[PDB]
Amino acid sequence: SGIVQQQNNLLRAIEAQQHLLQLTVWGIKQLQARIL
Amino acid sequence: SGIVQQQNNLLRAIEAQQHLLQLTVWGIKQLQARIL
Amino acid sequence: SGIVQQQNNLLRAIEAQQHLLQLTVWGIKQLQARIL
Amino acid sequence: WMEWDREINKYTSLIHSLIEESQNQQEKNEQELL
Amino acid sequence: WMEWDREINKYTSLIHSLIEESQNQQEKNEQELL
Amino acid sequence: WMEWDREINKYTSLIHSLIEESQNQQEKNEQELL
Numbered sequence: 001s002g003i004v005q006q007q008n009n010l011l012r013a014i015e016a017q018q019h020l021l022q023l024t025v026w027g028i029k030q031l032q033a034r035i036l
Numbered sequence: 037s038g039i040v041q042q043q044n045n046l047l048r049a050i051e052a053q054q055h056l057l058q059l060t061v062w063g064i065k066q067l068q069a070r071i072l
Numbered sequence: 073s074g075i076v077q078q079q080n081n082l083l084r085a086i087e088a089q090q091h092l093l094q095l096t097v098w099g100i101k102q103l104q105a106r107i108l
Numbered sequence: 109w110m111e112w113d114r115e116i117n118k119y120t121s122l123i124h125s126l127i128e129e130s131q132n133q134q135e136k137n138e139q140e141l142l
Numbered sequence: 143w144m145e146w147d148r149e150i151n152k153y154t155s156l157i158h159s160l161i162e163e164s165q166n167q168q169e170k171n172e173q174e175l176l
Numbered sequence: 177w178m179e180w181d182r183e184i185n186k187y188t189s190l191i192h193s194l195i196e197e198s199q200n201q202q203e204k205n206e207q208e209l210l
Contacts, residue, residue, distance in 0.1 A: 002171045004137050006079050007042050009167055011130050013086050013160040014049050018123055020093050020153045021056050025116060027100040027146060028063045032109070034107060035070055038137045040205050043078050045133055047198050049126040050085050054191060055119045057092050059112060061184060064099040066109075068177065071106050074205045076171050081198040083164050088191045090157055095183055097150060102177075104143065 001141060002167065002174060003039055003075060003079070004134075004141055006164065006167045006171060007039070007046070007137070008134060009160060009164040010046055010079070010082055010086065011127075011134060013157060013164060014046065014053065014130075015127060016153050016157045016160060017053060017086070017089060017093065018127065020097075020150070020157070021053065021060070022120070023146060023149055023153070024060050024093070024096050024100060025056075025120075027104070028060060028067070030143075031067050031100065031103050031107065032063070035067055035103075036109075037209060038133065038140055039075060040202075040209060042130065042133045042137060043075070043082070043205065044202060045126060045130040046082055047195075047202060049123060049130060050082065050089065050198075051195060052119050052123045052126060053089060054195065056116070056123070057089065057096070058188070059115055059119070060096045061092075061188075063112060064096060064103070067103050068099070071103060072177070073175055074201065074208060076168075076175055078198060078201045078205060079171065080168055081194060081201055083161075083168055085191060085194040085198060086164075087161060088187050088194060090161065092184070092187045092191065094154070095180060095187070097154075099180060108143070
């Protein structure tokens with residue numbers, strides 16, 4: 001059970017990290033549009 | 037078996053996220069080079 | 073034992089990736105302030 | 109930048125898929141424990 | 143950009159919490175291995 | 177930016193090593209299932 005619970009925790013962390021990554025990509029694209 | 041398979045899954049996700057990260061770092065470096 | 077160790081490994085990877093993410097965030101914010 | 113765009117797209121899809129597979133395995137593992 | 147800021151803040155806080163939860167669980171699991 | 181650079185390199189190297197170690201442990205865990 002503990003192991004399975006921990007897997008859930010890690011998966012959730014990976015998902016949140018993915019949202020953050022998507023946000024940084026947006027930002028980079030915005031900056032590139034103005035900068036180039 | 038299921039727990040081990042789920043560790044593989046998570047590791048693969050982390051690896052893919054790492055590629056993404058490296059791509060964001062490249063982009064930021066390109067932009068930094070132009071602005072400064 | 074091996075499984076729990078792997079979990080530690082994965083968590084450590086997630087933490088390091090989070091550090092990198094925070095770094096990219098810092099970079100984007102710097103660029104954004106310099107241009108906009 | 110053109111290659112960058114291509115790779116962003118490629119890895120984003122890959123991650124989405126892995127997340128999906130992981131969610132499915134998580135539910136299977138949880139059911140097996142019950 | 144304001145919405146961007148809001149979202150960054152949101153997910154950063156969430157990840158921090160998840161990481162802490164995961165750390166606690168890691169400790170518990172190691173302890174149970176004994 | 178100079179400190180940023182330093183830190184990027186540091187964490188990039190750390191992640192690479194952690195991934196490597198996780199890969200090794202994964203194959204050990206898979207072997208152990210037999």
